[PDB]
């Protein structure tokens with residue numbers, strides 16, 4: 001029923017203005033530009049709005065605390081993040097937030113939700129579908145797959161299928177409106 | 183919580199590892215070749231590690247993307263074990279480094295840090 005959406009920034013939130021300058025959308029706007037109608041009874045919470053390259057270890061302590069104070073209040077959490085360090089964060093959170101009572105799903109995109117053929121809609125739709133499953137823990141949703149967050153690495157830099165589960169089966173893969181086990 | 187991750191290349195020396203420990207780095211990850219190991223000739227690397235391994239955690243992972251590490255597979259690996267190197271097993275590189283940082287965040291007992299890196303905490307490792 002009840003989903004919390006925490007924003008950290010990244011390419012998913014990106015918008016280039018008419019000038020060298022770079023602007024960021026809030027997590028609420030991302031969802032709406034991605035064209036997500038489903039998400040209902042969904043809250044938003046914008047922790048950061050940076051390129052994930054800037055992430056420091058202190059940023060993780062912030063995120064951990066926030067998550068630890070929301071895990072009882074929600075059935076599912078989604079965290080949108082830049083792809084550059086997405087897997088660093090998901091791994092670290094898995095260690096910090098030892099035993100999560102709910103699914104916590106990290107996602108992002110290689111193409112800003114702004115543009116056409118963005119992978120944002122698929123990623124978010126996937127994250128949300130898994131945030132509402134029964135399955136507690138830390139995960140990455142990307143290119144239609146759900147992967148254990150502490151077994152995920154960025155494997156490609158200029159390509160939709162950017163993340164893989166390493167030496168560990170995919171938790172679930174999308175197949176229409178159905179999340180299939182592995 | 184300061185960790186240095188250095189990629190093994192042919193002829194690399196232990197020089198920069200002494201420097202890191204002097205600089206206050208509390209942990210070091212080495213990205214080895216294949217299933218893992220250390221050169222026993224061509225550099226002071228192995229002696230440098232046999233030295234610093236007892237003082238700070240020294241972790242070995244693989245430069246390759248899939249299949250992870252096994253220091254029992256080769257003599258080059260076995261030597262690295264004898265020198266006190268902690269294997270990363272089948273952990274991702276992201277898991278290996280964050281796991282280390284998190285452990286160093288509340289302990290410095292190399293020997294303890296070592297049993298921890300070899301234990302499956304959250305589903306990150308086959309132990």
Ligand SMILES: N[C@@H](CC(=O)O)C(=O)O
Nearest residue numbers: 010011051052082083084
């Ligand atoms: N440099 C970007 C890349 C991305 O999000 O795709 C970031 O990680 O914030």
